[PDB]
Design a protein around this ligand. Sequence first.
Ligand SMILES: CCc1cc(O)c(Oc2ccc(C(N)=O)cc2F)cc1F
Ligand SMILES: CCc1cc(O)c(Oc2ccc(C(N)=O)cc2F)cc1F
Lengths: 306, 306
Amino acid sequence: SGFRKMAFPSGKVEGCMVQVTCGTTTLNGLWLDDVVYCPRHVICTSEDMLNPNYEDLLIRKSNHNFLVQAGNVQLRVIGHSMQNCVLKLKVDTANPKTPKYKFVRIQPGQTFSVLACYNGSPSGVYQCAMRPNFTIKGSFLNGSCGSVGFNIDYDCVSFCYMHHMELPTGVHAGTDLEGNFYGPFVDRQTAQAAGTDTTITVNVLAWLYAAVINGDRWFLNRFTTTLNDFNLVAMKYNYEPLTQDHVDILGPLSAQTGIAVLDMCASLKELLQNGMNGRTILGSALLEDEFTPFDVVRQCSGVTFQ
Amino acid sequence: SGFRKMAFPSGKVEGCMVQVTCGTTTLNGLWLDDVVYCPRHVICTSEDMLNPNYEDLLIRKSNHNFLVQAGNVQLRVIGHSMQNCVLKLKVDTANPKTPKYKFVRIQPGQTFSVLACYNGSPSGVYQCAMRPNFTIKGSFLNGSCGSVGFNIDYDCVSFCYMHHMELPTGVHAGTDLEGNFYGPFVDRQTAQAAGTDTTITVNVLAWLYAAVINGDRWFLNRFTTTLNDFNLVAMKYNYEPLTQDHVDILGPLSAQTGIAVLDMCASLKELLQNGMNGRTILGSALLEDEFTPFDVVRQCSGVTFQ
Ligand SMILES: CCc1cc(O)c(Oc2ccc(C(N)=O)cc2F)cc1F
Ligand SMILES: CCc1cc(O)c(Oc2ccc(C(N)=O)cc2F)cc1F
């Protein structure tokens, strides 16, 4: 019993974290096979983050300008290239701790674990979601760039995020492992403001099913609704519109608990219109939206990883 | 910026998790050097959890009755002994992934990371606190027994919890790694109810400092108070009494933010008496008490682990 914000085991990713230093800038890199991936703004100095021309800044960089340190050993850089907003540093040693892995570009609403690192050393792990405005609400300080977000399916690590920037509002932005930013953000210290932080409706519903499974049932009402009628309420509270795809994805949780998806929507509707009246759900006083339906099934069924 | 429920990197502990099977019962064990630690109720059957006599049940067990599997390899058990509520299974192979480690019995209010496991395979990691009633609010399903809680100080893993039981109320109980239960709980399926779940006052205050550091300052009032006057409010809301030791421990956070500890107490007092009026603090609608002062400093300063 009990439901917690749960991250994947980070050991497979810890063995891939290295320290990359260019000039006086040090951040983290990801060492997979014989390539080290890191944010391209490692080549930037302080005066340059306002308006960097990365192509021009890279002309003055050779392989030996990139210092890559794994633990206490220096990796030999034998080639380097820029792919979008990441650099790929070819090293002469394949990472012996390389796990089975994929590179995935996730959709908004999807969750992943972040291994926060500093100077190539892991500091902590927590669970994140890609917000609908393509930011993430993480915990990152100076030097955390290059920290990655990932999912694990048994023995395969799916890397989906690399941390690049912190916006003036305290939220965070980054790229996939191909170097393409999530959302409209750029690796420049400029005026870029995040859009509306809408709530991930399907995730709240999943979390409500998780609450029912674990004994929190006070919010179950006597009402039902339709997708169109619920979405009229979702729009007012800046909730994502619920689609039939979302209903379908919640099928398994609906079947296990015997509560029709549209019944749970009517329960959510009452919670949005009347608040929680000082009660709590799974130890929270607000509606949680960073659990996916698959996360709930995983944690309520005990899926492991080899 | 940003403040998150953050667990330690679990890689050092993942390499120690094994599967222990006795008869038809399978749970998790912790393999350090040439000893495997696991809950002693691995030797129990279903009819036996009501009133087990472990000394008698152990008489019918030999070394070869304990099947210990690390990954896909069978470990050779060459000795076994019961220490309080854990079994120590001497194996003939030292764990080559053994990290620097200690065994620590933590105090209530202290936090730690849990590596939830099933069949010796890690499933996820999350942060927990030892509640003042000596329970923990975890996420454990059948087969999770033997999962451990731990802290890391750079390169030393301090193991402080092994999971044993789930109470009828959905909370969790366990032992230190010497086999002594936290609180009055026993490894028997009996009537044992948890006491008052009081709030860890010093941890809430630490978390309020973390909020100030990250830009949430609306709760800062114009008032101050005394320890005795604040504690009169703490008692009403089932808060731990604050002591001078607690004030001293908050010194560093007080100095960094320039807010006297007793000023922050007066802010907490107003929050308890008037609620949050629908606002949030660090993304929460309730007062969080599972961050220690040391946790806040760690996450706000970027401490790493080698
Ligand atoms: C030119 C691109 C660029 C380079 C930087 O080095 C940079 O610096 C930071 C990045 C992230 C954080 C944080 N806390 O996540 C803090 C930082 F100072 C920002 C930035 F856009
Ligand atoms: C005789 C001692 C004993 C043996 C058990 O095997 C047991 O079983 C469970 C333990 C923990 C959980 C959970 N979800 O944490 C679930 C369980 F069924 C309980 C118990 F007291």
